[PDB]
Amino acid sequence: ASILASLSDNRGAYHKRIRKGRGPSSGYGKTAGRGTKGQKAHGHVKPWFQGGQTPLIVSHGRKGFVNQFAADMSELNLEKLQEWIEAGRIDPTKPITPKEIIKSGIIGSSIKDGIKLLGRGKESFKIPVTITVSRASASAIEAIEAAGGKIVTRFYTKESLKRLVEGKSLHTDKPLPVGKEHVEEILAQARSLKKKYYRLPDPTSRWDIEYYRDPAHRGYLSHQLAPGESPSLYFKVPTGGEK
Template sequence: MPPRLQLLSRASAAVSQPSYSPLAPFLYPALNQQRSASILSSLSDNKTAYNKRIRVGRGPSSGYGKTSGRGHKGQKQHGKVPVGFNGGQTPDYVVHGQRGFDNHFSTEMSPVNLNRIQYWINAGRLDPTQPITLKELSASRCIHGVRKDGVKLLGRGKEELTTPIHLVVSRASAEAINAVEKAGGTVTTRYYTEFAVHKIKQNQMDPIHSLQSRIVLAPESEEGAEAAADALAEEKKHYKYRLPDPTSRKALEYYRDSAHRGYLSHKVAEGHGPSLFFKTPGMGKKGAQRRSRAGGAQAAGGENRLW
C-alpha cells in the first residue's frame, strides 16, 4: 500500500524549525540609514579644498630644512622673483593694462571756511565791498593754492561771520549759504576749469563773468544785446581769455540749481527742475497738446458767455 502523502506533510509541519538571526534585535535601529536633524557638526573640507602652507627651514625631518628645498649656491638659491612675476607668462599688467588708480571724474577743490574769511576781513587783507573770488582768496593767501576745480565754501565758524560779503566760488555748502545770506551777503557758484584757474591767477581771465553770465546781466531787448556786445568788447581789451561755461550734464545740472545758488539758475523755467534728464510732469508734447486743448475750450466758453 503506497504511503499517505498528506500524513507525511502534516508530520513535517508539526516539527518546529528554529529561526536563525545573525544579529541581535537591539542592533537593527543602528543599521537603518538615517539622517540627523542637523549636519553642522559633521561638516568638513574636502581634502583638496585648500593647500597647506609649507614651512621651510624647520629641520631635516620635514623635507624642507637646511636649504629649504632650494639646493646649494647660485641664483636659484639666493635670488628672488620680481613682484608680479607669473612664471614666464605675460604679466597681467601687460595683458590688461594698468588702470583704476586715479579717478578722472573726481572733483578737487580747495576748501575755505567762513571764520577764516572773517579773520582776513578783520585784518584788512580782504575787501568786503568788492566781490570775493578765488583770485582775491589766492592773492591774499587766505587759501594756499587753488586746486583744479576751484574753491568750495564751508560753514565752519559761521557764528563768527558778521560782515555782509559777496562770494563767487565753485561750490558752497547749504550751511555756508544760509550763514552768508543771514549776514546780508550773497553767494554765487560758478564753473571753473583747471585752465581757467591758472589764467585767473595770472590776471588773464575774468574771474566772474562768462558769455552766459553776460547775457543774463543784459535785458532782453535790442539795447540789452548792444550792451552785452559792448561789455564783451570791453572784456577783450582787459583779458586775453574768456571764462568758459560748463558742457557736461552733471555740471550743468549743478549750476542750474537755485538751491546751490548756481549762476545758470535763470535758465530754468518756472515750475521746472534743474535736471536735464527727467522731464517735469505735464511739460512734454502730450502735456502741450492737453494745455492747448484746454485753452481752446476756455476761449470758446468765454465767447459764449452772457456776462
C-alpha cells in the first residue's frame, strides 16, 4: 500500500544465509560441514602447514630483492594526451606542466614520484605543445618535436609535486643559478612575489644529475655541457687517433 511498505532490493541481490547447527533438514545440522572428529573439527590447522613436508620457498629459496629506492613514475602516453587536448581538457597553447597534468585527471588522482611521457600512439600525434615532465622516452621526445613542440625533463619529487598543485611553489624550467652575480636578481624577484613560495629542488645524486644533464632526455641541466663533454660525472669521451 504505502511506498515505504513496498520497497525492496532486486531479487538477484539477496542470497541464502547458512545457519549451521539448526537441524538435519537444513543440510548443516550435526557437524556443520566439518566432518567427523578430526583436527579440522576439534581445532584449527595452521595455514602454512603442509603436513610437515618442506615448502617450495625453502627447498628453492626466495629469489631476488625488492627495490625500495626506485621512483614510482606515473606513466602518460601520447594517445591519452592527444585525446585530452581534443576534448578541451588541457590547454595546448599554454605550457603543460605537472600542475596542469595532475588537475586534469589524465594520470589519475594519485601523485607519484614523477611523470614519464611515453610514446604509445606516437604516429597519430601532430599537436605542437610545450610539455614539462620528469622523464620521457626516446620515441616520445622525437614525436613531440617532429610536430613542432618543445619538451624539457625537470627534476621533481613526491613533495615538490604536491606543492606545485597546492600553489606553494611556482614552476620553472631552469635550475637555481650559482655565483655572487645572481643574488641581486634572485633576491629582488623573491620580494616582489609578496608570498612565501617554496623553491623546487634540484638533483643532488650522481645518477639524477647525469640524467637531467644530457641532451638525449632534454634535461634542464644540459645547457651546462660542452659539445664534446659527456653527461657522466666520472667517465669521459676518449680521443681517437694514433698516439
